[PDB]
């Protein structure tokens, strides 16, 4: 490690930061080329590096306190693009809270379409990354925090990630966020209804969001597959709750009795616990279903299924704040498309 | 075996009384406690005593039980100002485990030559527990090395250093908690 | 256990203590004498005892307050002896913080010139027990506190431990106290410098603190050796921080930014852990420095090595404190020392 | 190995200074640095220094790691127009490893015999480096081994003459560059 | 190579530069630290290093001109050392001409007490590093030129030098500097005579120089071993010269025609040869003689033997300048030393 240190990033996280709030987004080749470590002239003197860029972000925070951070990798960015969790999550980005992870970690090929990179190839390529704050904190800290990344060139090697349009691979990248889901304390159901007709990409106001995978998916008509979403607890570990999954369609009442004597997932987070990996395979699903629908649909009219979340008991806490998760589809496995979407126009807003 | 020639440690000096008055006695009279670290004076006037915080001044101090041989170098440093012919003084040295007079001499020297002498010699610490004594314990009614000096004629005899030298074989254990060590300065 | 318990102390902890506060300091003997157990008139009516004394100290505390204990044996003790950490740790002393360890256990040969001990002997020679609090409260309780100290006879055989000043053992056993470190909440680096020319004792106002072991040390002129240091968590487990070690000189300004470029451990502390054993090898040092250096000198003429100790990222919390730690140089091994030591007067005043 | 008796080196003459002025003080003071090869005295008067540029003196001065023992020998030549019942001087030698007054001294001796003495011991040399010194070196804080000399009475004690002797294990690495020694004349 | 260079420095040779000229005298320190090259900051963030240090020079100039550059490393300095090739060619010092050799090279441990160096250990000791043109120009170039030196840490592990006064090795490393000689063009023998009387240093004016290797030597009374010298050509291919060494006394008169009756060598250089090494065995030398002989010793009355130097034919050139050869006594075998030396005041001006 010591001697494939490359360089050392220090954000700074201030107590009142919001969610939403970008701590900072910049050219990947400026991250890389901070201090002068043991392989900082290699880095700039070597005309390909085989190995995965590493870095390790530290930052730890007490229990009773919670803050959801993401730091995501894009390939180039045009003009003013978005730096919401949807568009900016995709490629290679993860998610944690420091009061359950206290050091993250994420290894990532700059060069989906080989096996190297380099740090010219960063620089006129646009590589870029954000650092933002997807949810703030549950309680704010005494004082100004700063998160501090270490930068390696790894020594595992560069694999390609492409997509074939009309030939998925098996499984099916997709990295979509589903949307941020938030209980507040109380004895609420607070069901919530996540629709699978996935197309599109993300609404916006008079405008869409849209990332490169969610891209690809958009263009076939029908689809299928096992579904798996990875789930992240983005508040505090004080705010307990215990959350019910399942699919169903979006014609049901809030009030359903029998809402879980469908084949439904409860989860529970334990203190330092965040993630939890759903998986809802094709048995929960009579055919495909559009890709799109247009966005005015009603949720009686609505034909496709939904992926649906509710409070099994109640979400409770002696500190205020209310109970937030994350969704996001990582992967599609089996999956299964029929013919080529002419397209609609425009798409539902996410959570 | 650490070792390095001609290394020893400053222990103590002792200057005698300025204001000493032969008028009402000949002689004054001071004590080095070796291995409890103290210096004891006459009431005979003002004596400038002063125990360095040399390395060996500092382990003595703290070592709890001790075992092994020291070596002891005293040098008189006298009043240059006399004549030669006129040197008319002389130190009785006496070399005792303890200050009561109930307990007779291990070792006795007298010296009186002109303006400086030295005087080097081996003491060694035996005690008790496995051959290690504690300094002045009440329990196996254990001892300790002094070593005295009778000054006949404190103006011409007038400065007394001690110092010690470790041996290969010195060995310690335990600690004793002590007050802070003063620092001139 | 039962058949050999002799003993039972209780100490106040009042919720306001502070930390250098002495909670009882009193001959060993007294305390092995209070109470009517099992073993108590064997105790006394024994001329000689194998088996060492083995304690057991309980007191739980809630995870958002913190305090350092610590309960120190001594052979002897003359006038008004120091009761610091530095002067009262180096024969056998544990120092544990209750919101980590709820009940903490210690055996030691009270003889360490043999492999036997007396309830007389005790009394007669003085040995000395201590119990300190190195820390105050992060955090005041709700009421005073009591710790229970449970005594017994162990049928764990006593075994000494000499010092050959001129003969060194491996490993050299010194439990030097380098320093109690503080690091206040926020982004700061708080760079701090523990010298390793450790001989001359601990510094105080005109006067210096000393005890047994590193009396030994400063015997010599130079030395080397694999340094093993034991880390200790003083403050509550909500005080979050990330500290970095390593080896460097004093003459490298604060904001050095690759300072980590230098081989380095770092350090994160798990709720309910409240130890870390750091050890420097002799790889880290080139050759033999000075065991005393004059007490005058400074960081930029300084010649020999020094224990470095900073903020990787931040010190963060949710109630006030700084995060602190406690250092000492347990043991050292595969030493390695050169020439007898005249001596310097003075020595720099510890943390 | 090679060697031949009683041939030791000549390193330097202090000659005490002649126009020393009593009524201001009494003694006066000088110090040689035995490794470096330096001399040091008082502002008390006109002293008159000589390092010799003998095989040794030449070799420690060139020499960057030093390890290993040395003999030192100092002979003190006097006033010989001193009747000797008149004799009232003495000097004080002192061996530290440095200057600076915050260091004890290894060694000390008081020498008051009349018109003439000598003082022969060893002196070995222990540094980190592979148990090589480097001469007052900011490395480890390294060091050098310096006699100082209190001279009570210089119109008595005048002269002192300093001969090293190299001992069979003496070991050197490195060259010092140093810049020409003078040749009296 | 590459990987393992650590910095490159340049230093200016001006197309007038003498002789005696120091071209750059600084702390190796220095020399270590300019630029940053793929191992600088391990350089910088190591403590320890066994690869010795090795450095490749390099400028070449055409075969009509030449000039003597030395490159040497020595452990320490104090005040206004001395700049003569004699003081400073004793411990590491490689000396050339680039009209034969075009780029140089050199390794050497830069702490002969053990294996291992550091950079610190480096500053802190003040290890010398002297560049200085020995002979100047036999021809001025058209204009100023360069000399550039890569600096790398070599696979090579270091190994120590040290000298036991009392106890010389076999072979013994002198490396002492006899001089410079000089043979002007023409039929003249132009005898040369150098003294093997070389204890006590270098002549001055009203003084003497002196480097260690030479002052272990003084330290004996007798010697005799087999000598080992190197002889360098100093000036340009373009003056040719045969040169003839023999051993003989001082009171042989510069005409006896029977010179070459003697055991000699005769040293003809190609074009592009430079070194040449000699060795005069001990069957040369009935017996030990005198280390030192005081300098004002005659020619006549020296009783130890001299290293001749001669013309055998002519010193020849189309171009001006006259023939210029450096001799530097290298290693002693198989010495055998007799005695102490109580030392003679002062000593002979070498070439």
Same mark, same amino acid.
């Given at each position: #490690?010591?001697?494939?240190?490359?360089?050392?990033?220090?954000?700074?996280?201030?107590?009142?930061?919001?969610?939403?709030?970008?701590?900072?987004?910049?050219?990947?080749?400026?991250?890389?080329?901070?201090?002068?470590?043991?392989? $900082?002239?290699?880095?700039?003197?070597?005309?390909?590096?085989?190995?995965?860029?590493?870095?390790?972000?530290?930052?730890?925070?007490?229990?009773?306190?919670?803050?959801?951070?993401?730091?995501?990798?894009?390939?180039?960015?045009?003009?003013?693009?978005?730096?919401?969790?949807?568009?900016?999550?995709?490629?290679?980005?993860?998610?944690?809270?420091?009061?359950?992870?206290?050091?993250?970690?994420?290894?990532?090929?700059?060069?989906?379409?080989?096996?190297?990179?380099?740090?010219?190839?960063?620089?006129?390529?646009?590589?870029?990354?954000?650092?933002?704050?997807?949810?703030?904190?549950?309680?704010?800290?005494?004082?100004?925090?700063?998160?501090?990344?270490?930068?390696?060139?790894?020594?595992?090697?560069?694999?390609?990630?492409?997509?074939?349009?009309? +030939?998925?691979?098996?499984?099916?990248?997709?990295?979509?966020?589903?949307?941020?889901?938030?209980?507040?304390?109380?004895?609420?159901?607070?069901?919530?209804?996540?629709?699978?007709?996935?197309?599109?990409?993300?609404?916006?106001?008079?405008?869409?969001?849209?990332?490169?995978?969610?891209?690809?998916?958009? #263009?076939?008509?029908?689809?299928?597959?096992?579904?798996?979403?990875?789930?992240?607890? #983005? @508040?505090?570990?004080?705010?307990?709750?215990?959350?019910?999954?399942?699919?169903?369609?979006?014609?049901?009442?809030?009030?359903?009795?029998?809402?879980?004597?469908?084949?439904?997932?409860?989860?529970?987070?334990?203190?330092?616990?965040?993630?939890?990996?759903?998986?809802?395979?094709?048995?929960?699903?009579?055919?495909?279903?559009?890709?799109?629908?247009?966005?005015?649909?009603?949720?009686?009219?609505?034909?496709?299924?939904?992926?649906?979340?509710?409070?099994?008991?109640?979400?409770?806490?002696?500190?205020?704040?209310?109970?937030? &998760?994350?969704?996001?589809? @990582?992967?599609?496995? +089996?999956?299964?498309?029929?013919?080529?979407?002419?397209?609609?126009?425009?798409?539902?807003?996410?959570? | 075996?650490?070792?390095?020639?001609?290394?020893?440690?400053?222990?103590?000096?002792?200057? @005698?009384?300025?204001?000493?008055?032969?008028?009402?006695? %000949?002689?004054?009279?001071?004590?080095?406690?070796?291995?409890?670290?103290?210096?004891?004076?006459?009431?005979?006037?003002?004596? &400038?005593?002063?125990?360095?915080?040399?390395?060996? $001044?500092?382990?003595?101090?703290?070592?709890?039980?001790?075992?092994?041989?020291?070596?002891?170098?005293?040098?008189? %440093?006298?009043?240059?100002?006399?004549?030669?012919?006129?040197?008319?003084?002389?130190?009785?040295?006496?070399?005792?485990?303890?200050?009561?007079?109930?307990?007779?001499?291990?070792?006795?020297?007298?010296?009186?030559?002109?303006? %400086?002498?030295?005087?080097?010699?081996?003491?060694?610490?035996?005690?008790?527990?496995?051959?290690?004594?504690?300094?002045?314990?009440?329990?196996?009614?254990?001892?300790?090395?002094?070593?005295?000096?009778?000054?006949?004629?404190?103006?011409?005899?007038?400065?007394?250093?001690?110092?010690?030298?470790?041996?290969?074989?010195?060995?310690?254990?335990?600690?004793?908690?002590?007050?802070?060590?003063?620092?001139?300065?």
């Amino acid at each position: #490690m010591l001697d494939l240190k490359i360089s050392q990033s220090k954000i700074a996280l201030p107590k009142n930061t919001v969610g939403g709030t970008i701590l900072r987004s910049d050219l990947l080749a400026n991250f890389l080329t901070e201090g002068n470590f043991r392989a $900082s002239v290699d880095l700039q003197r070597t005309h390909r590096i085989k190995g995965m860029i590493k870095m390790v972000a530290t930052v730890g925070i007490p229990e009773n306190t919670g803050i959801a951070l993401a730091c995501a990798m894009n390939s180039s960015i045009r003009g003013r693009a978005s730096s919401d969790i949807y568009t900016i999550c995709s490629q290679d980005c993860e998610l944690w809270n420091p009061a359950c992870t206290k050091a993250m970690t994420m290894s990532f090929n700059p060069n989906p379409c080989s096996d190297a990179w380099s740090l010219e190839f960063l620089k006129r390529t646009g590589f870029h990354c954000d650092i933002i704050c997807v949810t703030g904190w549950t309680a704010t800290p005494m004082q100004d925090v700063q998160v501090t990344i270490d930068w390696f060139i790894s020594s595992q090697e560069c694999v390609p990630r492409t997509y074939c349009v009309l +030939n998925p691979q098996n499984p099916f990248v997709l990295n979509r966020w589903m949307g941020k889901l938030t209980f507040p304390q109380g004895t609420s159901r607070s069901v919530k209804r996540m629709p699978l007709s996935i197309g599109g990409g993300a609404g916006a106001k008079s405008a869409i969001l849209m990332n490169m995978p969610n891209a690809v998916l958009s #263009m076939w008509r029908y689809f299928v597959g096992d579904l798996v979403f990875e789930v992240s607890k #983005m @508040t505090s570990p004080y705010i307990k709750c215990t959350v019910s999954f399942f699919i169903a369609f979006g014609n049901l009442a809030d009030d359903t009795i029998n809402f879980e004597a469908f084949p439904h997932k409860l989860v529970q987070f334990g203190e330092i616990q965040e993630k939890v990996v759903l998986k809802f395979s094709q048995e929960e699903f009579l055919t495909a279903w559009s890709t799109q629908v247009r966005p005015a649909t009603t949720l009686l009219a609505d034909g496709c299924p939904y992926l649906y979340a509710m409070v099994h008991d109640s979400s409770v806490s002696t500190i205020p704040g209310d109970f937030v &998760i994350g969704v996001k589809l @990582t992967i599609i496995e +089996n999956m299964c498309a029929y013919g080529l979407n002419p397209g609609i126009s425009g798409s539902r807003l996410l959570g | 075996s650490i070792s390095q020639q001609t290394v020893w440690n400053q222990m103590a000096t002792v200057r @005698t009384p300025l204001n000493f008055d032969s008028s009402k006695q %000949s002689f004054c009279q001071f004590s080095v406690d070796l291995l409890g670290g103290g210096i004891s004076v006459d009431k005979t006037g003002d004596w &400038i005593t002063l125990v360095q915080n040399s390395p060996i $001044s500092n382990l003595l101090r703290v070592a709890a039980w001790k075992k092994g041989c020291l070596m002891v170098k005293v040098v008189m %440093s006298g009043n240059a100002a006399v004549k030669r012919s006129d040197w008319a003084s002389l130190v009785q040295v006496f070399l005792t485990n303890s200050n009561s007079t109930e307990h007779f001499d291990a070792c006795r020297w007298t010296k009186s030559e002109p303006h %400086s002498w030295e005087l080097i010699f081996p003491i060694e610490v035996c005690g008790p527990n496995n051959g290690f004594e504690m300094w002045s314990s009440e329990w196996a009614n254990q001892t300790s090395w002094h070593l005295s000096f009778l000054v006949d004629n404190p103006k011409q005899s007038t400065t007394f250093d001690v110092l010690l030298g470790i041996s290969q074989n010195f060995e310690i254990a335990g600690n004793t908690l002590m007050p802070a060590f003063s620092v001139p300065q």
